[PDB]
RNA sequence: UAAGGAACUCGGCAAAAUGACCCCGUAACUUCGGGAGAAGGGGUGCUCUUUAGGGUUAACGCCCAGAAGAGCCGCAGUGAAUAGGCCCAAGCGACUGUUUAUCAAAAACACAGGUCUCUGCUAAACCGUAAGGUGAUGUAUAGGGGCUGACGCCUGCCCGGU
RNA sequence: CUGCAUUAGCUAGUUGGUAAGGUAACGGCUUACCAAGGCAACGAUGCAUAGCCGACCUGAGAGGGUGAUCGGCCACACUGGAACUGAGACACGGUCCAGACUCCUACGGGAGGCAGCAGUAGGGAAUCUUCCGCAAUGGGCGAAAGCCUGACGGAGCAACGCCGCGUGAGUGAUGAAGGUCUUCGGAUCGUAAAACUCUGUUAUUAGGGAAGAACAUAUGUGUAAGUAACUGUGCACAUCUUGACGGUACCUAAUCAGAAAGCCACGGCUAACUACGUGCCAGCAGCCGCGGUAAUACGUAGGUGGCAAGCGUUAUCCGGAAUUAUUGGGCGUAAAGCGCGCGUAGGCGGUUUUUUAAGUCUGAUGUGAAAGCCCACGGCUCAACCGUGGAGGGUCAUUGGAAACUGGAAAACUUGAGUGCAGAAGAGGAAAGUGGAAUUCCAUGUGUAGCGGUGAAAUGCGCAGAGAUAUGGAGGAACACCAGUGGCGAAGGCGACUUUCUGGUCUGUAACUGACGCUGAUGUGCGAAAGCGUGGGGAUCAAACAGGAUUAGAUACCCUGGUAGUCCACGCCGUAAACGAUGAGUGCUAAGUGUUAGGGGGCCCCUUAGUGCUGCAGCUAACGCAUUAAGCACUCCGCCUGGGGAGUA
RNA sequence: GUCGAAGGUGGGACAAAUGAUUGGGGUGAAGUCGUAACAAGGUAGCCGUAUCGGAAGGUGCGGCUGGAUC
RNA sequence: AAAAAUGG
């Protein structure tokens, strides 16, 4: 059955980006919403909407394509997984694409990007890479 | 035979201790021959090998390498024809064997006229004669 | 495999065999047993000396000796160079390195060591054949 | 019966040796039952002290039966008598049984199992001249005869001859 | 902190308790009594191997390999046992006993143990001289002078390693002679040589000649404690005396380019080509290969390349090797999805709130010896080397903080998973019963010269009347048509009809439970055909077998027969190209079109679950796959690591 | 007197070496017999199983396409 | 839809 909702969400984003879809509806959760908001703030997606419907709720992402229809999101990679979880210290926080990408991290100070983790001098579970 | 290496080492050491005592292997007969200044010398050395080196050995008259030869001449023919199927195997020769003068060695003559035996195979005929003569025909 | 599968049964590397097994074994006479010691060369005694025909496509009469080593192992050793002075019961030094043509010959006899004589007339690469500098 | 210990002899024939009870322990192989008492070892008398029990009785008493310890004596304690020698292999017959009374006990006979074959019942087979009987007060999962001979794996070719 | 399951059970002082003894000390450490415990798939037990570590080699790293020298710890002292002395030993150069082995003996008895430093024999491919000295450091005794110290400080031997410097430097075309090649012009060795000029690293000779040396002790002076005072004690300052190395390093002066260059390679990898000799011979070779007459690969020569007091060969480790892939690989056809279910352990797991702080993150403190790697500085003329100071190295320990995520606790939710209600189809399974066609055989009637079969024939059956044809009877097996990439089942598989028992699946509501889920080692079951056992049955077909043909032969293919078997019941066997050569679950990603079972809305549209075909993106070595993925992802399981040997022993 | 090394006796376990003889395996040539596979390989092949035959293989039963002209 | 092997 389903075993990694974060991975499912990232894979939904990847598949929609490949097909050059505009929007994306997925079941919602707090961690997913925080990931989507981080993506919007960083500029990888155009917009995020939350539908507080019955059951679980829904997250509606709107993807962003540059000029010439170029895709802003090159790739997403789940790093920590149910089968093997990865954590990193502040001094060992990884740089995605030499800094051109973000690493979404989950920290005691909320889920943030690797830049914020390094700035605040914290570590945590490296949720994902996005470049 | 389990003490043959010990035997070789003992022989070497004995030769080093005694210049006049020699040991050598004979290729034709394969036997190891011990040479000495006399029966008493060799007897003492044999006893010494038996006890000091604990290599019991037996001694005898060395074997003599004999040779064979043809006393009478004759023309002969060798034919090997296995043509049972497919690509077979064929060969034919007519050779005159003659007693050579003693000490002159083997002499091969090629009196082929008209290419009855192709010039490619004549060296093979000579090599076959040499190989077959290496093995004795009588003893 | 899954990470759980790898934890349960970790990965196992292929084991490597030596090309010169006879040099990796010693013999203790007092205990009458073998021992694992790596040697660069071993002394031996030529049990037999002769010539062998190489495997096809090559053709020649390659000089070789069947040698019993100091560790009691019997091997075939090629005799390099032109001409040799070896016979049965000769004491020779044997090093590793097989001769591709000869199937069962996996070692070389050092030239200019123990009984084996240097190559006569050799002038280039003499050290490989145990020949003194003529000068 | 010194010393020896199968040198005897066709052959260990005879003899010697083992032998009871308790405890420890016990192999190949096997049809899983066995082999097994395998083998190989230890203990065993007497006195005293302490002490768990069982049967029968109101109890006493009587009877059975252990355990621990400390001692004593001899060359030796199932102190006599009675009471397996054991082991490793091979052939044959599966096995218990039967036999030449009175020179042969076996590898011979029998055997459970297998197969062939005859027999539809007033059966076939068998005794008898017959009557009358056995078979059988049975009825083909039965009865008679031939051959083989537990069990396991199997059982080839020939119907010219009789 | 190590390998093996082709080692799965181990343990009886064993596990605990009570008492006693014992030891520096707790304790089954030991002994009595009470109980039956204790260990083990988180790998006990057993077997094999091994001193451990700081470190060392390698690698970009992750890792892999190793455990010389030097330092720490452990263990041992001919093998085994034991104690005595002693603060300390169950004691390398101590004791006792036993054993093996040397030597002395007067035969009664005695002595001994180089895995201390040299050395001997032996083994080996292989590893040093039976040196000087206690002068420095350290240790034992003593108040001290001092004595002992094969520790140690230094010589000898070895290119064994690293590092440093040499074997000359400048001008030198006049391109000398000579070697090699040559198109006979010349080209090359070549500024190389010769000749001139210079230098002395180094070498030779002669002088000067360190540091390492602090000292201790002795002797004067003071000063502190205590004493009535004194000697003495400690301290401070002073003075003579102490070096094996060794007259060694080093410095100064003089003489000479004179003593001091070898090794491998030159086909590709890979820097470097020509000639002669040889002729699948001799030989080379790390791999591809080279050598049979004009070889840049063999041998020599010239030249060239790489190094240089070294250069090559061999052995071993790491790398290259992503070729065990955590970083960082795979399983349709290349090796690799168990034949398939049911399921235990383990792994993993839907949404929200509160709480905890084991994992996670962030500080402080201690510690991670010295030496070593790395960075900086300083000292040997530089370097190796030496010293100093930093830096780093933990999966480490205590302690304070954070709460998103994983884990624990508590409480809610309905989407997953099940239950209810309304329907649907099905060769799903087991057991009885009933049919019709055909084959075989049997009994009759008619009827006669063949039938059967092959490429052709023959065997065979028939003339004792076959085959053909008509009627009936006996028996076994399989179910024509329907029938279809149709249906059902986990797979194997399931096809006449009827009845009885019974499993699963799909569709629609959203009453109900509220994460109850997924996967699944070990287990436990099913599993085509053949085969096996007992008993039954026996038509057809048909291994074996027998004839007849074909053929050079024909232990076959073809023909005529024909036994097991094929069939049934109950057991066993457990394998197939058991295949979609594609594990299960879940979600996401263009479309066109057929078909099966449903459902909703107006012949049409939408929809759920299957079953086919075509086809994007993406994937693939290609072929191809493609909402029934071989795409994009996450969880679990099984499996692979060149071919053969071998699915063998 | 207790404990107690070595030693002695006994039946087992494990490991290694060796052994008349024997089984298949690999390698080596220009050996002998056939021709099973690759083409429709001249009977499509292959998988499991059974049986038979000097040998490759043949035949039976079931399975696969990794076969199939017209 | 008869039979027609083999070739370092
Ligand atoms: Mg007597
Ligand atoms: Mg007597
Ligand atoms: Mg006798
Ligand atoms: Mg006699
Ligand atoms: Mg008797
Ligand atoms: Mg009997
Ligand atoms: Mg009897
Ligand atoms: Mg009787
Ligand atoms: Mg009688
Ligand atoms: Mg009798
Ligand atoms: Mg009989
Ligand atoms: Mg019999
Ligand atoms: Mg060891
Ligand atoms: Mg001592
Ligand atoms: Mg495959
Ligand atoms: Mg499958
Ligand atoms: Mg063929
Ligand atoms: Mg064929
Ligand atoms: Mg046949
Ligand atoms: Mg050919």
**DSSP-assigned letters across all residues of chain C:** --HHHHHHS---PPPPPPS-GGGGEEEETTTTEEEE---SEEEEEEEEEEEEPPPTT----EEEEEEEETTS-EEEEE--SS-----TT-EEEEEE---SSSTTEEEEEPTTSTTPPPPTT--SSGGGGT-----
Strand G footprint nucleotides (protein C-beta < 7 Å): 5-8
Residues facing A70 on adjacent strands? none
Q: Quick one: A69 and A98 in the same domain?
A: no
Distance CA B37, CA B22 (A): 10
Q: Quick one: A95 and A128 in the same domain?
A: yes
Q: Quick one: A4 and A60 in the same domain?
A: yes
CA angle B98, B104, B105 (to 5 degrees): 75
Q: Quick one: A69 and A14 in the same domain?
A: yes
Whether C114 contacts C84, CB under 8 Å: no
Q: Which residues of B touch C87 (CB under 8 A)?
A: 25, 27
Q: Which two tokens stand for residue C124?
A: 């280039």
Last residue within a domain, chosen from A73, A91, A109:
A73
- Phi, psi dihedral angles at C64 (to 5 degrees): -150, 165
Residue in A111, A56, A59, A101 with CA at minimum distance from that of residue A80 = A111
Kindly list the domain boundaries of chain C, sorted by start residue.
1-135
Whether C25 contacts C33, CB under 8 Å: no
Q: Quick one: A82 and A65 in the same domain?
A: no
Q: Quick one: A59 and A114 in the same domain?
A: no
- Nearest-neighbour CA in chain C from B37: distance (Å): 23
| Residues, chain A | 131
Whether C92 contacts C65, CB under 8 Å: yes
Q: Quick one: A108 and A126 in the same domain?
A: yes
Q: Quick one: A98 and A56 in the same domain?
A: no
Is the CB of B85 less than 7 A from some atom of nucleic acid strand F? yes
Last residue within a domain, chosen from A73, A88, A123:
A73
Distance CA C106, CA C76 (A): 7
Q: Do B8 and C68 count as a contact with CB atoms less than 8 A apart? A: no
- DSSP alpha helix (H) spans, chain A: 5-19, 30-42, 114-120
Q: How was this structure determined?
A: cryo-EM
Question: Which residues on chain B place their C-beta less than 8 Å from a C-beta of chain C?
Answer: 5, 8, 11-12, 25, 27, 30, 32
Whether A48 contacts A37, CB under 8 Å: yes
In chain B, which residues from 87 to 106 place their CB closer than 7 Å to nucleic acid strand G? 87
> A17: which DSSP letter?
H
Whether the CB of C45 is below 8 Å from some CB of chain B: the reply is yes
- DSSP alpha helix (H) spans, B72-121: none
Q: Quick one: A66 and A89 in the same domain?
A: no
A53 is in which domain, residue-wise? 1-73
Q: Quick one: A67 and A5 in the same domain?
A: yes
Is the CB of B88 less than 7 A from some atom of nucleic acid strand F? yes
- Looking at the structure of chain A, the number of domains it has is 2
């Amino acid at each position: 059955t389903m075993t990694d909702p974060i991975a499912d969400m990232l894979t939904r984003v990847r598949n929609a980006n490949m097909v050059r879809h505009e929007k994306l509806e997925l079941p919602a959760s707090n961690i997913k919403k925080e990931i989507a908001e981080i993506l919007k703030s960083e500029g990888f997606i155009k917009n995020v909407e939350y539908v507080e419907d019955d059951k679980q709720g829904v997250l509606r992402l709107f993807l962003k394509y540059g000029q010439n229809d170029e895709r802003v999101i090159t790739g997403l990679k789940r790093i920590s997984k149910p089968g093997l979880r990865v954590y990193a210290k502040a001094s060992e926080m990884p740089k995605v694409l030499n800094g051109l990408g973000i690493a979404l991290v989950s920290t005691s100070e909320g889920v943030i990007t690797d830049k914020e983790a390094r700035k605040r001098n914290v570590g945590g579970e490296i949720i994902a890479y996005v470049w | 035979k389990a003490d043959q290496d010990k035997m070789t080492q003992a022989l070497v050491k004995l030769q080093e201790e005694d210049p006049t005592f020699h040991a050598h292997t004979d290729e034709e007969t394969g036997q190891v021959i011990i040479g000495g200044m006399g029966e008493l010398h060799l007897d003492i050395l044999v006893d010494r090998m038996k006890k000091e080196f604990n290599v019991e050995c037996n001694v005898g008259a060395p074997m003599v390498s004999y040779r064979e030869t043809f006393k009478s001449s004759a023309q002969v023919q060798g034919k090997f024809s296995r043509q049972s199927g497919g690509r077979g195997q064929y060969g034919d020769v007519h050779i005159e064997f003659t007693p050579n003068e003693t000490g002159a060695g083997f002499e091969f003559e090629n009196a082929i006229v008209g290419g009855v035996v192709p010039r490619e195979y004549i060296p093979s005929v000579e090599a076959g004669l040499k190989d077959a003569m290496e093995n004795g025909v009588l003893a | 495999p899954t990470i759980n599968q790898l934890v349960r049964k970790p990965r196992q590397s292929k084991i490597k065999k030596s090309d010169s097994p006879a040099l990796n074994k010693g013999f203790n006479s007092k205990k009458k047993k073998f021992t694992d010691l790596n040697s660069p060369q071993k002394r031996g005694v030529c049990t037999r000396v002769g010539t062998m025909t190489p495997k096809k496509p090559n053709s020649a009469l390659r000089k070789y000796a069947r040698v019993r080593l100091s560790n009691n192992i019997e091997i075939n050793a090629y005799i390099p160079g032109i001409g040799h002075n070896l016979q049965e019961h000769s004491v020779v030094l044997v090093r590793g390195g097989r001769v591709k043509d000869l199937p069962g010959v996996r070692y070389h006899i050092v030239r200019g060591a123990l009984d084996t004589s240097g190559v006569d007339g050799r002038r280039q690469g003499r050290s490989l054949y145990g020949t003194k500098k003529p000068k």
